[PDB]
């Protein structure tokens, strides 16, 4: 009849489908939720092996077919793009509504109806967390920052040093502190370089005061360290001058071909006399650095660095106040190196980590700036470090951008799932079906944790949610909002007075994204797979 | 392709030789930022025009 | 027996799916065929020489790496064949190991592609069965050595039978040096990694 070259699926065996893939995908990660939660074995059929907990990543490196199990898979790599933390929640909250709702739509509920019901159910959540589970950070000071590092570097391969990391970032993201226009103090994560190193333990990694390269000196001659750094940025290679495209060389008297070749070279001589003749101490460019200049920057007793990053150029221009130079020209037609275009900082070091050298760029004035060096066991080991002390800094990040935290542990899940339930009696009279399931699907994070941590799942829950319950029941008992789970023990606990804090960001952006890819799931009920 | 709309909308005039590059050629704006969409890339933005 | 002018009419218009059906095999078998006939039969039937220089590159290939030896990828089917040569950029070099196992002359100069992908990143050494692509009895029994260079998506080397002008125990430099007799090679040590939105960085504006 139709004559489509191609499978056609229509009716409850799509969305059957549709919903399969879905919770093979939060089955993937639902073992990496929560501190009892343990990392994953990844290779990829060539011998590369990536431990890693994080739910982006594990998500990313996976090959995946299904329509639905990639919208879950971009679903988490955009909370990790837009927040940096709980990829894995928001996949695992997706699922569990994309699962109740299919199960309200085989009991004859039209998708309409529960797509209506979600969308009220999450704005009444967001409303309901914006209202009541916000805890403002004014009143607790830097424990509140610290305490959300350490929740967010558990479950990962940095958790019981949270002690000392969550300094570590904390002083590193207040290192990188800038304010702009419109009085906003901004955090620009990413500045923090991260560099990777196996040796020591993990309590040996360095929070450098300045800036790390993963750059060398370009020759053995010039010296490993300067005291009294004057830095000189450059956007362009010093090499022998060659002539442009359009620029030909013809030569008809031979007195003139040994002029021509030696102000071949006498051109970039003449750059770096200009370049040097102002003190400067230190020269950083992109581009590459031949040998004649390399001992011209050696006679002088300069440090002389090529194929500097771009980014590493920028962040180091910008820190020790000079500017980058794409090249020496003037507004009057001259070449010309003025003394105010060199940046300075209080001590330029090459120091060696393990059978190998970085440069130091210490104590930069007129900014301030940061690096991390990450001293493991193996590059595995480093790799997820890195993961896992990004995830720390863009937690820090939203805390400090946005003064507003949660309690952890599932305490607000709990909560917000109560207050759904209550609320679902008064609206709608078939989306209420809708916003019970979006409370009960909300419980998943919590049934999650304790099942992690191999304890009595169905009971730990019961007596969280008879405790939000009674919070929210009785005028008197608000101080209850904040119980959530302490995994450890295997009791319920106040998350807050314990110090389980995270973004509401975090929260609220997992919970606007899930319910969006499980409306955007629900709406398909027909499905045609051409043949390639 | 994209020359006629953006002279519509900013009123802008194309200038194909710096000869004719004048003043009563360039299209005011009362604001030309570069806005970042939270991570997910950056738009360019030129809002309020005269003449518009 | 008349109306030969049958002019089938709706006959296809009922059937064009089966057709299509098995028509997408057809190409995707032809693909195949097509990409092995341009080596199969395309060409099968047809003191400064002690290189004191050898030495100290064979040296200084001993010290290539340190982290690991690495392996030539093992290609397990022919339409990975096919998906991986067109795949990846035109402008690279890909180089394809065609060997079956036991026959003499090929541990040699697998550890010689070993050497080589472990000096050249850039490189794409593979290796793949004999059997696999399905090559015929000429080519099994009188073309075991075969080195099939990619670049731009068409051959641009096409050595077959490189015993003769390599040897049976030949080192690295060796094949280097033969590959290199038709311009075929393309022109500091980290840590261990640097690379970690695009928030860079300000200053009080
Ligand atoms: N010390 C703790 N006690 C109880 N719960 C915690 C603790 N630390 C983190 N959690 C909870 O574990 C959950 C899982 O977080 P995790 O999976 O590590 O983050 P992500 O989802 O970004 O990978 C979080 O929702 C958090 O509330
Ligand atoms: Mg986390």
Known sequence: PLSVFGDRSTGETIRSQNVMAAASIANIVKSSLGPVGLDKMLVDDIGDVTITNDGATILKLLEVEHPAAKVLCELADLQDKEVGDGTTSVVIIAAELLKNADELVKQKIHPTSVISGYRLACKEAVRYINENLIVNTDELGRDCLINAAKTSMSSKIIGINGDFFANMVVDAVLAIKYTDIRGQPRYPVNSVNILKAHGRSQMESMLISGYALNCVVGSQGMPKRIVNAKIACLDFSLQKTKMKLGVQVVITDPEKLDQIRQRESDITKERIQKILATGANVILTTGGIDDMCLKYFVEAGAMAVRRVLKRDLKRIAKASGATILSTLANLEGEETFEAAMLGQAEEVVQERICDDELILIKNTKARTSASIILRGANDFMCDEMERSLHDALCVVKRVLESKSVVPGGGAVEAALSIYLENYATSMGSREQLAIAEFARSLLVIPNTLAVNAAQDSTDLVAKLRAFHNEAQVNPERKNLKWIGLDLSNGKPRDNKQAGVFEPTIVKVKSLKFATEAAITILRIDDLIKLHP | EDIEFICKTIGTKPVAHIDQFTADMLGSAELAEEVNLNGSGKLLKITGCASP | ?205
Not at chain 3, 65 to 85: A, C, R
Not at chain 3, 121 to 145: D, E, H, M, W, Y
Not at chain 3, 151 to 177: C, H, M, S
């Open chain 3, 1 to 205: 027996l008349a109306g030969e002018g049958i002019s089938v009419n709706t006959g296809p218009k009922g059937v064009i799916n089966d057709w299509r059906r098995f028509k997408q095999l057809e190409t995707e078998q032809r693909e195949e065929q097509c990409r092995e006939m341009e080596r199969l039969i395309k060409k099968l039937s047809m003191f400064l020489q002690q290189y004191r220089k050898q030495r100290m590159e064979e040296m200084r290939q001993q010290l290539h790496k340190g982290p690991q030896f690495k392996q030539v990828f093992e290609i397990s089917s022919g339409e990975g064949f096919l998906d991986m040569i067109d795949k990846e950029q035109k402008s690279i070099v890909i180089m394809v190991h065609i060997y079956e196992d036991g026959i003499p002359g090929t541990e040699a100069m697998n550890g010689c592609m070993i050497c080589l992908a472990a000096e050249y990143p850039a490189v794409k050494f593979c290796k793949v069965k004999s059997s696999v692509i399905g090559a015929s009895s000429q080519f099994t029994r009188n073309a075991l050595p075969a080195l099939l260079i990619y670049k731009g998506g068409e051959l641009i080397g096409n050595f077959v039978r490189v015993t003769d002008q390599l040897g049976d125990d030949f080192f690295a430099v060796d094949l280097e040096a033969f590959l290199q007799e038709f311009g075929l090679l393309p022109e500091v040590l980290t840590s261990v990694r640097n690379s970690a939105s695009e928030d860079s960085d300000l200053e009080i504006d």
